[PDB]
From a paper:
Mutations in BLM and WRN are associated with the rare genetic diseases Bloom and Werner syndromes, respectively. Novel structural motifs found in the domain, such as the acidic β-wing, the BLM-insertion, and the C-term extended loop, may contribute cooperatively to the specialized functions of BLM in relation to HJ.
The structures of human BLM RQC complexed with a phosphate ion and an arsenate ion were determined at resolutions of 2.7 and 2.9 Å, respectively. The asymmetric unit of each crystal contains two RQC monomers (Mol-A and -B), which are bridged to each other by the ion (P1 or As1) shared at the interface. Consistently, the phosphate or arsenate ion was a critical determinant of crystallization, and could not be replaced by other salts. For the arsenate ion complex, the X-ray data were also collected at the peak wavelength of arsenate (1.0439 Å) to calculate the anomalous difference Fourier map.
Residue numbers in the entry: 1074 to 1194
Write the structure that this text describes.
Amino acid sequence: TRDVTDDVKSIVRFVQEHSSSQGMRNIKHVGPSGRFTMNMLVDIFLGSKSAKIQSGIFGKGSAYSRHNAERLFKKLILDKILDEDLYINANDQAIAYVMLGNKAQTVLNGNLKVDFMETEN
């Protein structure tokens, strides 16, 4: 039903912004520790107040039910727009964190439109 292209474009723009300090000579890289879990991305999006970041896309998710906002990211991974790798921390825990998939650049070029099915329950 509902077309979510502009939202995904911004989610993608956003995820990539928090990957480096783009600009100054040393384009130094973030993560794995500074990368987001899907859940932290949901929280941020749904302008939660446990959100790690509270700028960029913080407001944007306010018309989505948590359940849906979830399903949207699940989709964005599936669709290879966003992807997720594992990180192992010092206490030997495996944490799945998000990053762009080979499809992210596509959506940023108007070339893919993203549509979403709003689910109840």
